[PDB]
Amino acid sequence: GPLGSDLIVHEGGKTYHVVCHEEGPIPHPGNVHKYIICSKSGSLWYITVMPCSIGTKFDPISRNCVLDN
């Protein structure tokens, strides 16, 4: 199953979808406290949802975690 359009995850019990439009790390739609790394493997997409440090949030364009304040 080479389905890489969108993977489903659970944020606080609730289901959310993760979709990658570009190759690179982007925040999590539901909760920006987490982000997903979108990587290309030839013509296949691999995604991984990692949480950032508490107190900070991930930015899509900057591609890093900024202080949520």
DSSP collapsed to 3 states, 18-69: EECCCCEEEECCCCCCEEEEEEEECCEEEEEEEECCCCEEEECCCCEEEECC
Amino acid at 24: G
| Cα–Cα distance for residue pair 57/66, rounded to 1 Å | 5
> What are 9's strand-pairing partners?
16
Residue 12 three-state SS: coil
The residue behind tokens 């993977």 is 7
Domain ranges across the chain: 1-69
Euclidean distance between CA atoms 30 and 17, whole angstroms? 9
Cα separation, 19 vs 28, whole angstroms: 9
Separation between Cα atoms, residue 41 and residue 23, nearest integer Å: 10
